[PDB]
C-alpha cells in the first residue's frame, strides 16, 4: 500500500536516471535527480564505506511521497554543484521528467 | 577626508571562488559579483558560467550551479526577483530559484554576445537584454519568453533601470533610454573609450572608465574621477575627484546623494556627490587587483572580488544585515 | 506485500548500481547488474523513443523475486558485451553484491 | 591424394571477430579459437582479451565478455569443463559460465607471462598453467585457487593432456611430462626454433613449426611437414610430408590415426598418420592468411581464423553437429 506507493516512485526514479539522452533547464533537472538518487542510495561514511540503511531509504522515499517541505543538501562528487532543495520540489521534477518521457 | 574607525570597518568574510579545486579555476577569477535582495546572499560568477551563492558576512556556502554551457564563457550579470535569480551569459538568459531549481531557459538566435540587462517600466515582470551586437531583446520574466526584438545602433556594456534605463555603450558614452519605448532621450559623454562601471539612483548616474582601450602600446588606464550625471534635471554634474583612479562605484542605498568609490588597490572613498570635501576614506587588503565591487541593499555590506580569485566582505563588526 | 517484496529488490538494485567503486569477477558482476537495470528500466523502440511500461517493470521484478530460470539477453551500448543469463542468476548476484556492501 | 566432393565440403558460416565496430578491432585479428565441448559453441579471443561465443555452423552470436584487463593483452587459450569456460591471459586465469556469469578469478604474482594450460591427472578438476617464465602453477578448478607453484627450466608455448602432458617449449622441443608429478619423462626435438601448433591423442603427438624465429634478415618460415611422435611406445615417427607448409594440425577425434593439416592459404589435408599416401585434399577461401584452426569434438566442424579478422566454419552441407 504505502509499499505500493514507494515502489511506484522507485520505478520513476530508476527510469529517469542514467539513460542515453535540448534546453539548459533540462541539464540542471537531470543532474538534480541524479544527485537525489545518490543522497538516498549512495551514502558513505568518512573513509567512504557504504552506509546501508533501509530506514534511510524508506524515510527519504516517504518524504518524497508526501512532498515534504524539508530541504536537503545535494552535492556533486567534485563539490562544484550544490543544491538545497525540498522533497516537494524534487517530487514535482521527478513526475514532470517521467511524464515527458511518455510523450 | 576622514579615516574610518576600525570599530566601523573590518573584514567580515572571505572566500576563494573559483578555488583551485573548482572546475573553472583554470579559466580565471570571478566574472561578476552581486548582492541578492533577499536571504542574505552574495552571488559570484565564474569565467565559464558557474554561479555560486554565499550566506551572510562570513560567506557561508549556500548553492552553486552552472547556468549555461561552459563554452558560452563568463557569467556576465545577475538580476534578482522574488521567484529567483536571473543569470546572463553571452548566448542565453537563465532563471533559477535560489535553490538551484530551474525556472526557465532562453537561448534565442539573436543572443550572439549579450553583456547586460536591466528591468524596464514593468517592475520585475520584464527585462531588457543587450550587448556587443546590434539587436536587443525584451523578455517577459513571468512567462520566460522573448516578447520583442529591437534594433540598436549603439552596443552596450551595462544597463540599469532607475528613473530611466541608463545604458553604457562600449565606447564610453551613456544613453538615457525611455523605459517604456526604449528610445534614446539623451546621450552623455562619460569617458573617452570605455566605461568600467555604472550605477544609478533615481536622481544620479555615476560611472568609472577611461580614455583608451588596451593596445600593445598602451594599457587601459582608469580616470582620476567618477563621472556624475543629474537624472532629475537631465544635465551633467561636476565630476568627483578620485586620485587613486576610479575603477568601481555604487550609489549608497541609504545615503541618497552619496557614492562609494573604489580603486584597484581596494582603497574606498564614501563621498557625498553634492560636496566631495567631506568623504570617509578606508582601505581593504585585497591579495590581488580588485576587479568587481558591490554594496548590499542596506548599505552595510561591501563586497570586493580580486584577480587572485578572492571575494571579500567588509563592513561594521556590529551585526550587519545585507537586506531588510 | 508483493509490493513490499518488489520495493526491497528495488532498494538493493539502486544501492549497488552506479556507485563510486579488486578482482576481475567483480568487474563482470557490476556490469551485468547495470545492464540488467537497463533491460528493466531503459527499453527504447526503434528510433530510441523511451518505452514506458509499468507492466514490464512489474514483470521483470516479479521474475527476479521468483528467481525465474527464464534467460534474458543483456547487451552493452556498443554491443561488445553480451550476457544470456537467468533471473535466478541475476538475483543471486544482486543479493551477494548487496551483502558485500554491508561488510 | 583425392579431392573433396563439394557435397561433403562447403563453407557453412563466417563471422568477423573483432569486427570494425568492436572496441578491440584496432588491436588486430583473433588471438585464438576453440570449439567448446558442449552447446555447439565456437569461442574466439581478441588481442585485448575479449571472448566471443558463437552457435552452430552459421556462427550465430551467443555471448561475449572481456576476461581480463585490456592492458593484459591477448586471450591466449580456452579450456572447457561442465561448469564453464576457462580463459588464460598473460597475467591471470579466469573462469565463467558460458552465460558470462563469473565463476572465479585468479591473478597470482607468479603469473607474469602465461601462454598455455592443460588438464592434468585429475580429469577436469585441475589445470597446469605455464608460459614464457620460469614458474608453473597448479590450479584447483573446483575451488578456483592455486594449490602448487613449480619451478621450470623450460618455458612453454603449448600444453595439452592426453596420455601425458605434452609440453611445447618456445625453442621448438616437446617435453613429455608425467601428469601426476610433472617431471619430464622424455624430450623430443620437433622443430628448430619454434612450434606454431601442437595437438595430441592418447597415441600421438603432432606439431607444426620452423627452424628460425623472425629477424629483420629472415621471416619465420614454416616446415614442409608435420612432426609426429608415438606416445604409446614413446618414440619419434616418420614426419608427414606437407609441401604447402604446415601451419596448423589437429588430430581427428573419430578417425584415430588421422591428422588434419592446414597451411596459411587455407589448404587442408586429411591424412592418415600410418600411411600418408592416401589423404583427402580440400581448399577453403580465407580472405587473409590463416592464423588459427580447430576441429569440433565430432570431427564434423572445421574452423579457421584469418589475419583479416574472419573466422570460418567448414564442413558437410548435411546437418553437422559440433558435439554429442
Coordinates of C-alpha atoms in Angstrom, one line a residue, chain B residues 102-271:
Chain B
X102 CA 15.5 25.6 -12.9
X103 CA 12.7 28.1 -13.8
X104 CA 13.3 28.9 -17.4
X105 CA 15.9 29.0 -20.2
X106 CA 16.1 31.3 -23.2
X107 CA 18.6 30.7 -25.9
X108 CA 17.5 32.9 -28.7
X109 CA 19.2 33.2 -32.1
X110 CA 19.7 36.9 -31.7
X111 CA 21.7 36.3 -28.5
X112 CA 25.1 36.4 -30.0
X113 CA 27.2 38.4 -27.5
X114 CA 24.9 39.7 -24.7
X115 CA 26.6 41.8 -22.0
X116 CA 24.0 43.5 -20.0
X117 CA 20.4 43.5 -18.8
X118 CA 18.0 45.6 -16.8
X119 CA 14.5 46.0 -15.7
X120 CA 12.2 48.3 -17.6
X121 CA 8.9 50.1 -17.0
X122 CA 7.2 47.0 -15.6
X123 CA 8.8 46.4 -12.2
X124 CA 10.3 43.0 -12.1
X125 CA 8.0 41.5 -14.7
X126 CA 10.2 42.4 -17.7
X127 CA 13.8 42.8 -18.6
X128 CA 15.8 44.3 -21.5
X129 CA 18.9 42.5 -22.6
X130 CA 21.6 43.8 -24.9
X131 CA 25.3 43.5 -25.6
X132 CA 28.1 43.9 -28.2
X133 CA 25.6 43.3 -31.1
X134 CA 23.0 45.3 -32.9
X135 CA 19.9 43.7 -31.6
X136 CA 18.2 44.0 -28.2
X137 CA 15.6 41.6 -26.7
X138 CA 12.7 42.2 -24.4
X139 CA 11.9 39.3 -22.1
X140 CA 8.7 38.5 -20.1
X141 CA 10.1 37.3 -16.8
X142 CA 6.9 35.7 -15.7
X143 CA 6.5 33.6 -18.9
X144 CA 10.2 33.2 -19.7
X145 CA 9.9 34.2 -23.3
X146 CA 11.2 36.9 -25.7
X147 CA 8.3 39.3 -26.4
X148 CA 10.1 41.8 -28.6
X149 CA 13.3 42.2 -30.6
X150 CA 14.7 45.7 -31.1
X151 CA 17.4 47.1 -33.4
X152 CA 20.2 49.2 -31.8
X153 CA 22.9 51.3 -33.3
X154 CA 24.8 51.5 -30.1
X155 CA 26.3 48.4 -28.4
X156 CA 26.0 48.2 -24.6
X157 CA 28.2 47.0 -21.7
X158 CA 25.9 48.0 -18.9
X159 CA 22.1 48.6 -18.4
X160 CA 20.3 49.6 -15.2
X161 CA 16.8 50.9 -14.6
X162 CA 16.3 53.7 -12.1
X163 CA 14.2 56.7 -13.3
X164 CA 15.2 55.7 -16.8
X165 CA 17.2 52.9 -18.4
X166 CA 20.8 54.0 -18.1
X167 CA 22.7 52.4 -20.9
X168 CA 26.5 52.4 -21.1
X169 CA 27.9 51.8 -24.6
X170 CA 31.2 50.1 -25.2
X171 CA 32.5 53.5 -26.5
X172 CA 32.3 55.3 -23.1
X173 CA 29.0 57.2 -23.7
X174 CA 25.8 56.7 -21.7
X175 CA 22.5 56.6 -23.5
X176 CA 19.5 57.5 -21.3
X177 CA 16.6 55.4 -22.6
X178 CA 12.9 55.9 -22.1
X179 CA 11.9 52.8 -20.1
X180 CA 8.6 52.4 -21.9
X181 CA 9.7 52.9 -25.5
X182 CA 13.4 52.3 -25.3
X183 CA 14.1 55.4 -27.4
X184 CA 17.2 57.5 -26.6
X185 CA 16.2 60.6 -24.6
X186 CA 19.8 61.9 -24.2
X187 CA 23.4 60.9 -24.8
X188 CA 26.1 61.7 -22.2
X189 CA 29.8 61.6 -23.0
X190 CA 31.1 60.0 -19.8
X191 CA 34.6 58.6 -20.7
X192 CA 36.8 58.6 -23.8
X193 CA 36.7 54.9 -24.8
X194 CA 35.2 52.7 -22.1
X195 CA 33.1 52.5 -19.0
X196 CA 34.3 50.0 -16.4
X197 CA 31.3 50.5 -14.1
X198 CA 27.9 52.2 -14.0
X199 CA 25.4 52.7 -11.1
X200 CA 22.4 54.9 -10.9
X201 CA 19.7 56.0 -8.4
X202 CA 16.5 57.8 -9.3
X203 CA 18.5 61.1 -9.1
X204 CA 22.0 60.3 -10.4
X205 CA 24.2 58.4 -12.8
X206 CA 27.8 57.6 -11.8
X207 CA 30.4 56.0 -13.9
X208 CA 34.0 54.8 -13.9
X209 CA 36.0 54.4 -17.1
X210 CA 38.9 55.6 -19.3
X211 CA 40.1 57.3 -22.5
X212 CA 41.6 54.3 -24.4
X213 CA 41.0 50.6 -24.5
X214 CA 44.1 48.3 -24.3
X215 CA 46.6 48.0 -27.1
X216 CA 50.1 46.6 -27.2
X217 CA 51.3 50.2 -26.9
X218 CA 49.2 51.2 -24.0
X219 CA 47.4 49.5 -21.1
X220 CA 43.8 50.7 -20.5
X221 CA 44.2 53.4 -17.8
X222 CA 41.3 54.4 -15.5
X223 CA 40.3 58.1 -14.9
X224 CA 41.2 60.0 -11.7
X225 CA 37.5 60.7 -11.2
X226 CA 33.9 59.4 -11.2
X227 CA 31.7 61.0 -13.8
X228 CA 28.3 62.3 -12.5
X229 CA 25.0 63.0 -14.2
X230 CA 21.9 64.6 -12.8
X231 CA 18.9 62.4 -13.7
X232 CA 16.3 64.7 -12.2
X233 CA 17.2 67.7 -14.3
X234 CA 19.0 65.8 -17.1
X235 CA 22.3 67.5 -17.1
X236 CA 26.0 66.7 -16.3
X237 CA 27.4 67.5 -12.9
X238 CA 30.9 68.2 -11.7
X239 CA 33.0 65.0 -11.6
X240 CA 34.0 63.5 -8.2
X241 CA 37.9 63.8 -7.9
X242 CA 39.4 60.4 -7.1
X243 CA 43.2 60.5 -7.4
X244 CA 43.7 56.8 -6.6
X245 CA 41.9 56.2 -10.1
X246 CA 38.3 55.2 -10.0
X247 CA 37.6 51.6 -11.0
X248 CA 34.2 50.9 -9.4
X249 CA 31.3 52.9 -8.0
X250 CA 28.0 52.2 -6.3
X251 CA 25.3 54.6 -5.0
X252 CA 24.8 54.3 -1.3
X253 CA 21.2 52.9 -0.9
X254 CA 20.5 54.8 2.3
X255 CA 22.7 58.0 2.0
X256 CA 20.9 59.0 -1.2
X257 CA 23.4 61.6 -2.5
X258 CA 26.5 59.6 -1.6
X259 CA 28.7 57.4 -3.8
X260 CA 31.0 54.6 -2.8
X261 CA 34.2 54.7 -4.9
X262 CA 36.8 52.0 -5.2
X263 CA 40.3 51.8 -6.8
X264 CA 42.1 48.7 -7.9
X265 CA 44.2 48.6 -4.7
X266 CA 41.0 48.3 -2.6
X267 CA 41.0 51.9 -1.4
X268 CA 37.5 53.1 -0.9
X269 CA 36.0 56.6 -0.6
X270 CA 32.5 57.2 0.7
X271 CA 31.7 60.6 -0.8

